[PDB]
From Swiss-Prot, chain A:
Protein name: Baculoviral IAP repeat-containing protein 1e
CC terms in the record's Gene Ontology section: IPAF inflammasome complex
Gene: Naip5
Self-association state and partner proteins as the record states: Component of the NLRC4 inflammasome, at least composed of NLRC4, caspase-1 (CASP1) and some NAIP protein. Flagellin binding by NAIP5 triggers assembly of the inflammasome, a huge complex that contains a single NAIP5 chain and multiple copies of NLRC4. (Microbial infection) Interacts with S.typhimurium (Salmonella) flagellin.
Effect the entry attributes to changing residue 703 to C: Strongly reduces production of IL1B in response to bacterial flagellin
SMART domains: BIR
SUPFAM superfamilies xrefs: Inhibitor of apoptosis (IAP) repeat, P-loop containing nucleoside triphosphate hydrolases, RNI-like
Gene3D superfamilies, alphabetized: Inhibitor Of Apoptosis Protein (2mihbC-IAP-1), Chain A (1.10.1170.10), P-loop containing nucleotide triphosphate hydrolases (3.40.50.300), Ribonuclease Inhibitor (3.80.10.10)
Taxon lineage: Eukaryota, Metazoa, Chordata, Craniata, Vertebrata
Tissue: Detected in macrophages (at protein level).
Function: Sensor component of the NLRC4 inflammasome that specifically recognizes and binds flagellin from pathogenic bacteria such as Legionella or Salmonella. Association of pathogenic bacteria proteins drives in turn drive assembly and activation of the NLRC4 inflammasome, promoting caspase-1 activation, cytokine production and macrophage pyroptosis. The NLRC4 inflammasome is activated as part of the innate immune response to a range of intracellular bacteria.
Listed GO MF terms: ATP binding; cysteine-type endopeptidase inhibitor activity involved in apoptotic process; metal ion binding
UniProtKB/Swiss-Prot annotation, chain B:
Domain notes: In an autoinhibited form the C-terminal leucine-rich repeat (LRR) domain is positioned to sterically occlude one side of the NBD domain and consequently sequester NLRC4 in a monomeric state. An ADP-mediated interaction between the NBD and the WHD also contributes to the autoinhibition.
Free-text disruption phenotype from the record: Mice show defects in inflammasome function in response to S.typhimurium (Salmonella) infection. Differences are however observed depending on the strain background: in a C57BL/6J strain background, no striking differences are observed compared to wild-type mice following Salmonella infection. While in a BALB/c strain background, mice are highly susceptible to orogastric but not intraperitoneal infection with Salmonella: enhanced lethality is preceded by impaired expression of endothelial adhesion molecules, lower neutrophil recruitment and poor intestinal pathogen clearance.
Role noted for this protein: Key component of inflammasomes that indirectly senses specific proteins from pathogenic bacteria and fungi and responds by assembling an inflammasome complex that promotes caspase-1 activation, cytokine production and macrophage pyroptosis. The NLRC4 inflammasome is activated as part of the innate immune response to a range of intracellular bacteria.
Residue stretches of each LRR repeat: 15-38, 94-117, 121-144, 146-171
Covered range of the whole protein: 616 to 820 of 1024
PTM note: Phosphorylation is essential for NLRC4 inflammasome function to promote caspase-1 activation and pyroptosis.
Subcellular location field: Cytoplasm, Cytosol; Inflammasome
Record text on subunit structure and interactions: Homooligomer; homooligomerizes following activation of Naip proteins by pathogenic proteins such as S.typhimurium (Salmonella) flagellin or PrgJ. Component of the NLRC4 inflammasome, at least composed of NLRC4, caspase-1 (CASP1) and some NAIP protein (Naip, Naip2 or Naip5). Interacts with Naip5 and Naip6; following Naip5 and Naip6 engagement by Salmonella flagellin. Interacts with Naip2; following Naip2 engagement by Salmonella PrgJ. The inflammasome is a huge complex that contains multiple copies of NLRC4 and a single Naip protein chain.
Domain of life assignment: Eukaryota
The protein's name in its UniProt record: NLR family CARD domain-containing protein 4
Tissue expression from the record: Expressed by intestinal mononuclear phagocytes.
């Protein structure tokens, strides 16, 4: 918004203090312009041609132009500000050929007053345009005041106001006396120009020699005084007495009435006005040409011995002309547009070498092979070739005036040796010292290559050409042009599909003849319309035109099959025969120079994927013998869900066209076939091509790997968002809404969904069935901001516009962060969705300014609230009275503040339903007083997590905590308890003690060897640092833990209980199944990891995944043996910490540690190894890197 | 090994179960820490190590310093290099050394070294002695070291002087039991 104005001060003022220098007598030369307005960076959306003719000038740095009238630097050329117009707001033959085609109709207004008022006639029915307006119109009525009509038709033309509002001196002192009138714009040495033998005349830069009469052009600021007069006047007699024929050799290495009147007749005929016509406005038929009304391309000039020589321009063709030359491109398109460009603009004469070219000859040889020369085709497709002058005498008029004859030969690819004078002219090209051109495609450049000096390639510059054509021809609609240019940086490979600039007429009909793209502008509509043009152009039946479509479609199946793009030309079992149909169709071509077996090339590599999409609907809604087993075959070769987002986004979004739906349930069944997988990560990351958002696709892998890095359910939640999103677009656009609906209900269930409804018209078909999701989620970390970027590549808008009366809306989820305000509009959105949903899940994360938000939130809401998380609040009284007065609360977690809630506590002991607490860092000996108010209420409790700073009253705790029937996970920790008898009573008088967290309370564990035998079905046990000797706790906890084979997660602390406890305990935990987590912190000296070594050799361990050997005494080659077998033979483990021995543990024998990295790489199913508290080097970085890349199933090595 | 990061790269890409490696050490004069640590960390590629000393001047006192990481060692050869007493104590310190050769010792054999702590190489089988400067009592305590190790199979005592009547103690040490 403002950052373009402040940044406009930044780079515009930084450039304003930089490059003010302007030599406003120098910058008028054309050749230095189109030379240096060609080969610069060119990343904008603006044509360099008429910006070199805008009145400004620029070098080639980032777009900073200057001028002579308004001298200011201007850069950052962006949309819709035409720089010829922005020049204003920031401050003979054409008229002759015009009225030549003058019809009979328009004579209520005279044509000569149209001649005296600046009008140009375009050779159609009575339509005009000015030389610098661009609008050809008819609509002729009576009283049309012509220049005032030009100010009254349309206000587009600012050329309206921009235009409306010697014989006695034959000595070098008298010649030099004429040279003392020297023009300022020439910094060339004047004295050498005096000694060059000229004298001045009186105009700009022409100059008149006295010996022969040399005057001529190419006079600029950095030229040579002698060179042009030598190499372009080699017969000046004073120069002959100055530099003779042996001295013009370095400049040589630097650079009849029937014949004449024949040249006058053919010169009068080759300036044809109706020759302009092209079917580039084919059915659109817009009143306009293709040079003054269309932009251009450039030349990839390539040398014959493989350097890519230059990228010349169209006047740079004229500078060093080629006596015989070939160009590659597209027939119908640019190449014949280049030839008819040469002839039609050769009927204009603006370039300073024009009007002196003699005889061009346009020819298209695709029609003929007529075994007869000039009179056949000049008398056939043109007017005539003369009868008094013979056809060989016409060829004698060629071979008598050869040096300025220019040829425009087309399509030797459809030509053999059958025309006589033609093919013998081409094979004997010396015998006419002429300029020959030819426009053969890249299938048959080899037959021309014997007669070539350099090759020329036509190439589109889709930076600016597509927005010039769609600018000028579609100024009627410019907001979709804004959609195009904003789409150019949302999709930065938009140049990767615009590959031919004169087959954008399908886009032209897809704006003026198909208005659907104006509200549906993404890619597949556009090149779907291009494919529809490929059905319209060469309209035919089910020939191998159509089997060229399908057969090159399975060439595209080989294209994305093994990711092969530039082919081998071996397997032509897909397409094969009649190459003229495939190159005439132009879906492919082949290699130019030598290969061993030559190489096929495409017009567009990503366009090939759209060909494979045509192949996929061909293999989706057609004969079901084995064809859809081929589409099913490759469609099952792509079966990994993390690859599905990007690869199925681009390619399956190409499949999102072609709505036929005869096996769309099979491909959305492949979308349901994607289940919870891990190897999909490097299934995508191993692949090579990524299509449009290519380094961004690398970033998609990085961020989704970051999603699985933290949260497995948020990663799969984003997977659910993209799978349900693209499956929703494909489902609604495929119209399989009642055909696949309960299968989509299988595609919904169990997945937790964050609320995204702005593609609501795809979703609102039947939301009641589409309503049984597992969860609903809103938050306010950076994930939802990236999702804002993802649609950017609302809630109640799509949600109530979705359903006017929602029904039975499921439960909800809230996260809030510390940067949240209290805007009431989103609180009204919360009023709507809380009025809709069942109940709320609610998470407070440091949210200040939420007291002023929780007052209107609970004010608007009613008493239906389940979960509240109280992460680091302010703990004020009024908002917890307002939270307090709502019944049916079920969940409240309180673990943060040293400040203790009192009214919320003792008044939280009133209601019913509550099952979640927490009491971390509070401190209470006496706060338990109205807790016996809760004691009649709730036998419904599912989370208990207590901390006190000292001893509380325990009789109430043993009483009603004894009165619990529905035990659960417990978190208990950290006070001066000193009472194992009350806790022995309550833990001895209960039933369901199967998830116990007793991490580090001051306590004597004599109870646990009594109450652990009372309950056998325990699954999770956590303990932090206690007293733990090696015969009392080792024998008694060897029995008590020995009879406890139901456990899954084990956290044992901090004892001098020594390796006998590893014998019996590592024995029994070795010999129990259903076990996942295991932790031996502050214990396991090296003989105890001998016990995990010899124990871990035999097995019985294959269920385990998580394991911690933090805090050994010393790991060394001992640990290489023990972690060799123990980190070898156990193919399910994934967790390891070796750390916090912090000062100096490089006593590990580092190369044997590299062998231990070989040993960890033996383990397939590992994820996180933590190799902390020793030095690495460069070497083991390369070692754990390279052996990490052996199987990439792991990702978490932590230094 | 003449007079080397490429071979460090060569062993440091993949590591498999090499049986034995033979190390040819030729004329070590320059001695920087980078080659000490690299050529030190190479030597764990095999299950047995055959170290060969060949006229290495920079390893006159750097025996135990370089080979401290090198726990894997099977045999060793000494070819014309200076050596200290504590380095000989490092030779007798390791127990996996099974075969040992020594040649061209001009300096007098100091006590408290190889011949004095001889009975620690409990798997000695092949022992090669050439050109050792000693006296009679050094040969006596040498033979006292010969009374300890009872797994020897091959003995060389070539080119020895100042050994008058030490052979009674040596042959007396050898002809005790059916060895």
């Amino acid at each position: 918004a403002f950052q373009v104005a402040k940044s406009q001060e930044e780079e515009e003022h930084k450039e304003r203090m930089k490059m003010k220098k302007g030599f406003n007598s120098q910058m008028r030369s054309e050749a230095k312009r189109l030379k240096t307005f060609e080969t610069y960076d060119t990343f904008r959306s603006w044509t360099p041609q008429e910006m070199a003719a805008a009145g400004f000038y620029h070098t080639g740095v980032k777009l900073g132009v200057q001028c002579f009238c308004c001298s200011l630097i201007l850069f950052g050329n962006s949309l819709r500000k035409l720089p010829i117009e922005r020049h204003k707001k920031l401050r003979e033959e054409a008229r002759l050929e015009s009225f030549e085609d003058w019809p009979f109709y328009a004579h209520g207004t005279s044509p000569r007053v149209l001649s005296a008022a600046g009008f140009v006639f375009t050779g159609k029915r009575d339509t005009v345009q000015c030389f610098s307006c661009g609008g050809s119109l008819g609509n002729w009525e009576e009283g049309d005041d012509p220049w005032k009509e030009h100010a009254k038709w349309f206000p587009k033309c600012e050329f309206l106001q921009s235009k409306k509002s010697d014989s006695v001196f034959a000595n070098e002192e008298l010649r030099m006396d004429m040279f003392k009138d020297w023009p300022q714009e020439s910094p060339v040495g004047v004295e050498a120009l005096v000694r060059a033998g000229f004298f001045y005349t009186g105009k700009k830069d022409i100059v008149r020699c006295f010996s022969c009469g040399g005057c001529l052009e190419k006079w600029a600021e950095g030229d040579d005084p002698m060179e042009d007069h030598i190499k372009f006047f080699p017969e000046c007699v004073f120069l002959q007495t100055l530099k003779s024929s042996a001295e013009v050799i370095p400049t040589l290495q630097s650079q009849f009435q029937e014949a004449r009147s024949l040249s006058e007749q053919l010169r009068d005929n080759y300036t044809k006005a109706t020759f302009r016509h092209m079917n580039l406005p084919e059915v659109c038929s817009s009143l306009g040409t293709d040079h003054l009304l269309s932009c251009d391309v450039s030349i990839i000039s390539k040398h014959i011995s493989q350097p890519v020589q230059e990228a010349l321009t169209i006047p740079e063709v004229f500078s060093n002309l080629n006596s015989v030359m070939c160009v590659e491109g597209e027939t119908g398109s640019g190449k014949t547009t280049f030839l008819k460009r040469i002839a039609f603009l050769w009927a204009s004469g603006c370039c300073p070498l024009l009007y002196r070219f003699q005889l061009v000859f346009y020819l298209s040889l695709s029609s003929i092979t007529p075994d007869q020369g000039l009179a056949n085709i000049i008398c056939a497709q043109l007017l005539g070739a003369g009868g008094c002058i013979s056809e060989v005498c016409l060829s004698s008029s060629i071979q008598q005036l050869q040096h300025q004859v220019l040829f425009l030969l087309d399509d030797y690819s459809g030509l053999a040796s059958l025309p006589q004078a033609l093919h013998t002219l081409i094979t004997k090209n010396y015998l006419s010292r002429t300029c020959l051109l030819i426009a053969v495609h890249t299938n048959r450049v080899r037959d021309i290559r014997l007669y070539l000096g350099t090759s020329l390639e036509i190439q589109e510059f889709p930076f600016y050409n597509t927005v010039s054509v769609l600018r000028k021809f579609f100024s009627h609609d410019i907001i979709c042009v804004e959609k195009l240019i904003i789409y150019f940086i949302d999709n930065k490979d938009l140049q990767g599909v615009y590959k031919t600039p004169l087959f954008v007429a399908a886009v032209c009909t897809d704006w003026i003849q198909n208005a659907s793209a104006q509200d549906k502008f993404q890619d597949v509509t556009l090149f779907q319309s291009y494919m529809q043009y490929l059905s319209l152009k060469y309209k035919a039946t089910a020939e191998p035109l159509q089997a060229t479509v399908s057969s090159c479609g399975q060439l595209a199946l080989t294209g994305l099959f093994s990711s092969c793009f530039e082919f081998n030309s071996d397997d032509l079992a897909e397409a094969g025969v009649d190459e003229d149909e495939k190159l005439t169709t132009l879906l492919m071509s082949k290699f130019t120079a030598q290969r061993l077996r030559p190489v096929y090339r495409f017009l567009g590599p990503l366009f090939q994927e759209f060909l494979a999409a045509v192949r996929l609907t061909e293999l989706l809604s057609s004969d079901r013998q084995e064809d859809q087993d081929l589409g099913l075959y490759y469609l099952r070769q792509i079966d990994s869900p993390l690859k599905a987002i990007n690869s199925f986004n681009i390619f399956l979004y190409y499949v999102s066209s072609h709505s036929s739906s005869k096996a769309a349930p099979t491909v959305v069944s492949h979308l349901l076939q994607l289940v919870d997988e891990k190897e999909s990560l490097e299934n995508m990351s191993e692949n090579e091509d990524y299509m449009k958002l290519h380094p961004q696709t690398f970033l998609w892998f990085q961020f989704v790997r970051g999603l699985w890095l933290v949260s497995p359910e948020s990663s799969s939640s984003f997977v659910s968002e993209h799978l349900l999103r693209l499956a929703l677009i494909f489902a609604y656009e495929s119209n399989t809404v009642a055909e696949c609906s309960p299968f989509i209900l299988q595609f919904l269930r169990g997945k937790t969904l964050a609320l995204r409804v702005l593609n609501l018209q795809y979703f609102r078909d039947h939301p009641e069935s589409l309503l049984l999701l597992r969860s609903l989620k809103v938050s306010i970390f950076a994930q939802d901001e990236e999702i804002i970027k993802n649609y950017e590549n609302d809630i109640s808008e799509g949600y109530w516009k979705l359903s006017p009366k929602p029904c039975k809306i499921p439960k909800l989820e809230v996260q809030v962060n510390n940067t949240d305000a209290a805007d009431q509009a989103l609180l009204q959105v919360l009023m709507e969705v809380f009025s809709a949903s069942q109940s709320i899940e609610f998470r407070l994360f440091n949210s200040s300014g939420f007291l002023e938000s929780i007052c209107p939130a609970l004010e608007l809401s009613k008493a239906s609230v389940t979960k509240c998380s109280m992460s680091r609040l302010e703990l004020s009284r009024a908002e917890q009275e307002l939270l307090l007065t709502l019944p049916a609360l079920q969940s409240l977690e309180v673990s943060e503040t040293n400040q203790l809630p009192e009214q919320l506590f003792h008044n939280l002991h009133k209601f019913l339903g509550l099952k979640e607490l927490c009491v971390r860092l509070d401190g209470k000996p006496d706060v338990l007083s109205v807790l016996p108010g809760e004691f009649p209420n709730l036998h419904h409790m599912e989370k208990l997590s207590i901390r006190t700073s000292t001893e509380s009253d325990l009789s109430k705790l043993v009483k009603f905590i004894q009165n619990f029937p529905n035990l659960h996970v417990f978190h208990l920790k950290c006070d001066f308890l000193s009472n194992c008898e009350s806790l022995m009573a309550v833990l001895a008088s209960c039933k369901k003690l199967r998830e116990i967290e007793f991490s580090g309370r001051c306590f004597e564990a004599m109870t646990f060897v009594n109450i652990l035998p009372n309950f056998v079905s325990l699954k999770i046990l956590n303990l932090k640092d206690q007293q733990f000797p090696d015969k009392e706790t080792s024998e008694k906890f060897a029995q008590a833990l020995g009879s406890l084979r139901n456990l899954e997660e084990l956290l044992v602390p901090t004892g001098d209980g020594i390796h006998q406890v590893a014998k019996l305990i590592v024995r029994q935990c070795l010999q129990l199944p259903c076990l996942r987590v295991l932790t031996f912190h502050d214990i396991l000296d090296d003989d105890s990891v001998i016990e995990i070594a010899r124990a871990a050799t035999s097995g019985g361990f294959q269920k385990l995944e998580n394991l911690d050997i933090s805090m050994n005494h010393k790991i060394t080659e001992e640990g290489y043996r023990n972690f060799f077998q123990a980190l070898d033979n156990l193919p399910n483990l994934q967790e390891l910490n070796i750390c916090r021995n912090i000062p100096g543990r490089i006593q590990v024998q580092a190369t044997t540690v590299k062998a231990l990295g070989q040993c960890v790489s033996r383990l397939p199913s590992l994820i996180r190894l933590h190799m902390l508290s020793w030095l690495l080097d460069e070497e083991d970085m390369k070692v754990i890197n390279d052996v990490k890349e052996r199987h990439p199933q792991s990702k978490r090595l932590i230094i | 090994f003449y007079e080397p990061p490429r071979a460090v790269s060569l062993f440091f890409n993949w590591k498999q179960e090499f049986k034995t490696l033979e190390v040819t050490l030729r004329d070590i004069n320059k001695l920087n820490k980078q080659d000490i640590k690299y050529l030190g960390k190479i030597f764990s590629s095999a299950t047995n190590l055959r170290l060969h000393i060949k006229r290495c001047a920079a390893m006159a006192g750097r025996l135990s310093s370089v080979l401290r990481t090198c726990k894997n060692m099977h045999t060793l050869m000494v070819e014309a290099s200076p050596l200290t007493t504590d380095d000989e104590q490092y030779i007798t310190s390791v127990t996996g050394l099974q075969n040992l050769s020594i040649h061209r010792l001009h300096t007098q054999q100091l006590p408290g070294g190889l011949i004095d702590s001889l009975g620690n190489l409990k798997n000695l089988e092949r022992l090669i002695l050439d050109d050792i400067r000693m006296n009679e009592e050094d040969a006596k305590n040498l033979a006292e070291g010969l009374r300890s190790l009872k797994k020897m199979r091959l003995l060389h005592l070539t080119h020895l002087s100042d050994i008058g009547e030490g052979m009674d103690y040596i042959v007396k040490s050898l002809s005790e039991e059916s060895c």
